[PDB]
Amino acid sequence: FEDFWK
């Protein structure tokens, strides 16, 4: 998926 903090 996608990184939360980037």
């Epitope: 998926f1 996608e2 990184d3 939360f4 903090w5 980037k6």
Partner: antibody, heavy 116, light 115 residues
């Protein structure tokens, strides 16, 4: 399910502290956020668990080190040459986002008290 | 003063409330995903939702629908909306953006629910 941090710390101004954040790791970045008493959150940086690559906020660049041990799957945050202003609850956090929703995970937090 | 929030807001249960996260002029709200968090005393901040537009929004896992994002180009302010306004909603509310290669947080809004 869970991030679990180390216990509270008390330090003298000029010393260092090392807080651990053990996953019950991720493939996503573990970010470190602190909150001074009666204040908002303050982002310190993140670490990538696979690479071990870091990205510190400019304020802490110089006196913060973030590491990981993928064997035991715990992230560490060491803050050096402590100031009274570094008195805060230090949180570790990580998560991921789809197109639909996001799944964040926070530690319980670690109170670090800095005073003479 | 990148992100600014109102310090306090009070409303009664059942009604809807809007919380603003004002961006400094030049830092256009339309270009950022505004991250919203709820924090009750003693616990870590918990993610509510992130919102850029109606076409670009992600809710928090297990966060009720009554929590919803919005924005306003003229005011240059991201908005969080709460519909149910249960007494459970009484907490501090922080906004955050990824600005100039760093995570910036707001001062926070203390939402009081009248009993």
């Amino acid at each position: 399910v869970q991030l679990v941090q180390s216990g509270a710390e008390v330090k003298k101004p000029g010393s260092s502290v090392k807080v651990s954040c053990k996953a019950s790791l991720s493939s996503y970045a573990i970010s470190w956020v602190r909150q001074a008493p009666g204040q908002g959150p303050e982002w310190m940086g993140w670490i990538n668990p696979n690479s071990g690559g870091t990205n510190y906020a400019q304020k802490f660049q110089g006196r913060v080190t973030m590491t990981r041990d993928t064997s035991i799957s715990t992230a560490y945050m060491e803050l050096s040459r402590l100031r009274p202003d570094d008195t805060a609850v230090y949180y570790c956090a990580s998560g991921y986002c789809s197109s639909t929703s996001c799944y964040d995970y926070w530690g319980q937090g670690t109170l670090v008290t800095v005073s003479s | 003063a990148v992100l600014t929030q109102p310090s306090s807001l009070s409303a009664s249960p059942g009604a809807s409330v809007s919380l603003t996260c004002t961006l400094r002029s030049g830092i256009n709200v339309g270009a950022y995903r505004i991250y919203w968090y709820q924090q009750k005393p003693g616990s870590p901040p918990q993610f509510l939702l992130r919102y850029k537009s109606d076409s670009d929004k992600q809710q928090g896992s297990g966060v009720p629908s009554r929590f919803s994002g919005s924005r306003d180009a003229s005011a240059n302010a991201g908005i969080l909306l709460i519909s149910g306004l249960r007494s459970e909603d009484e907490a501090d509310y922080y906004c955050a953006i990824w600005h100039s290669s760093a995570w910036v947080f707001g001062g926070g809004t203390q939402l009081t629910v009248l009993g």
